[PDB]
């Protein structure tokens, strides 16, 4: 396949960081996660692991012939900016960056607070 | 004031309530 313009979805949580490269219509062509590059336990919550995962996903999407990327970034920031810079460094182009984080309007009940 | 007094009151109430739960069926048999 050959998609010249795609999209990058970076989901950064407090316990991991996952990057998915999709077609502009929502079909994943290459994904990489912070534990897929050889990290275990807490070590996959660090910015370095986000860097490695972003680089690996960028390379696997690049070999499919991807040139430019729109970035939708999401989650409580732990390795967001590192992933952005790793996408830029690996030969890709970042067109737009948008934060799409799900925000309830006070529905559902959060779990009880840890102590 | 202090919370020692509330502590004494709650200890006594807790013991009484536990006793009142421990002998439910015997009390039901006797009273009725």
């Amino acid at each position: 396949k050959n998609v010249p313009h795609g999209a990058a979805h970076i989901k950064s949580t407090f316990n991991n960081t996952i990057v998915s490269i999709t077609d502009p219509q929502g079909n994943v062509i290459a994904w990489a996660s912070s534990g897929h590059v050889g990290f275990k336990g807490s070590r996959k919550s660090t910015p370095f692991a986000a860097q490695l995962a972003a680089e690996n996903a960028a390379r696997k999407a690049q070999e499919h012939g991807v040139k430019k990327v729109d970035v939708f970034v999401k989650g409580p920031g732990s390795g967001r900016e590192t992933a952005i810079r790793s996408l830029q460094a690996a030969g890709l182009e970042v067109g737009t960056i948008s934060d799409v984080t799900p925000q309830p309007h006070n529905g559902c009940r959060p779990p009880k607070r840890r102590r | 004031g202090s919370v020692i007094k509330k502590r004494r009151k709650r200890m006594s109430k807790k013991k009484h309530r536990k006793l009142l739960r421990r002998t439910r069926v015997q009390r039901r048999k006797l009273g009725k």
């Binding site: 660090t46 910015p47 590192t82 810079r85 | -």
Partner: protein, 155 residues
């Protein structure tokens, strides 16, 4: 260093060449507390560079310094259990000190068995960019523009 900045020592000019660079070099290469051996070593290296390269020792030494002088360095600062390698610009004094330190440090890993021609050979290499300390200089620059991801802290 908690109260304020420390005073700076004066630098004695050289009587043979008239530049503080050679006296700074002999101070850096000094070891075990023997000056005389140190200036004889550095002067022998200077004379071997003289006879080899065909140009003046001062100009080639300054050119080697420029080829080894860095502009950015890396400082490690910890927060929340994570250490970040922030890039920081370098004062000229620290740049010169690092250049001389790198030259003398990579002066001691050679196999060519005596100090004077070791120093002369690396001076020639650094003039031409063939040295080992220069490799670490472009390495430091590579991490300077490589580790730009951590700069908003500004510490």
């Amino acid at each position: 260093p908690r109260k304020g900045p420390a005073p700076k020592r004066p630098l004695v000019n050289d009587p043979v060449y008239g530049s503080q660079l050679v006296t700074q070099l002999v101070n850096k290469v000094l070891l075990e507390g023997k000056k005389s051996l140190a200036e004889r070593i550095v002067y022998g290296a200077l004379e071997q560079a003289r006879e080899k390269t065909g140009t003046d020792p001062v100009v080639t030494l300054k050119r080697a310094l420029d080829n080894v002088k860095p502009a950015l360095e890396v400082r490690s600062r910890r927060v929340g259990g994570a250490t970040y390698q922030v890039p920081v610009e370098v004062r000229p004094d620290r740049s010169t000190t690092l250049a001389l330190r790198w030259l003398v440090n990579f002066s001691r890993q050679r196999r060519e068995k005596t100090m004077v021609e070791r120093l002369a050979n690396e001076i020639l290499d650094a003039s031409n960019g063939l040295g080992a300390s220069v490799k670490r200089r472009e390495d430091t620059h590579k991490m300077a523009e490589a580790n730009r991801a951590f700069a908003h802290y500004r510490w």
